[PDB]
Amino acid sequence: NLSLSDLHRQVSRLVQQESGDCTGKLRGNVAANKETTFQGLTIASGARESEKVFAQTVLSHVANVVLTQEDTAKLLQSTVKHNLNNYDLRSVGNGNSVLVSLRSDQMTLQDAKVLLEAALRQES
């Protein structure tokens, strides 16, 4: 996905082009941000729209996904390493949590890896 407004713009554009009866196809490419660093920014404070889409996309994929204490631990290191808490975790188990929301519109690729793997774990 992408931002609601751009998604609607891309879709309206295709409909205007007379492909309304056609089914939509969506594919995107993850890119690493080598321009700016992770600083817990929001759109209002400098986060790129694509950064917010990335972060929110990962967030969506881990909705209700159980995070073990090992997962939580890894995120915690990043939190320490960046001296900033980017997650709203809800205690659901002695050592398990659930991510309910983010604290910024940025997410490091390393953190996304941990989270997406928890999602795949629960899946399998």
From Swiss-Prot:
Q: Spell out the subcellular localization from the entry.
A: Secreted
Spans traversing the lipid bilayer: none
Domain of life of the organism encoding this protein: Bacteria
Induction trigger: At 37 degrees Celsius in the absence of calcium.
What are the coiled-coil residue ranges?
A: none
What family classification does the UniProt entry report for this protein? Belongs to the protein-tyrosine phosphatase family. Non-receptor class subfamily.
So what does this one do? Essential virulence determinant. This protein is a protein tyrosine phosphatase. The essential function of YopH in Yersinia pathogenesis is host-protein dephosphorylation. It contributes to the ability of the bacteria to resist phagocytosis by peritoneal macrophages.
Record's protein name:
Tyrosine-protein phosphatase YopH
Organism, scientific name: Yersinia pseudotuberculosis serotype I (strain IP32953)
User: What range of the intact protein is shown?
Assistant: 2 to 125 of 468
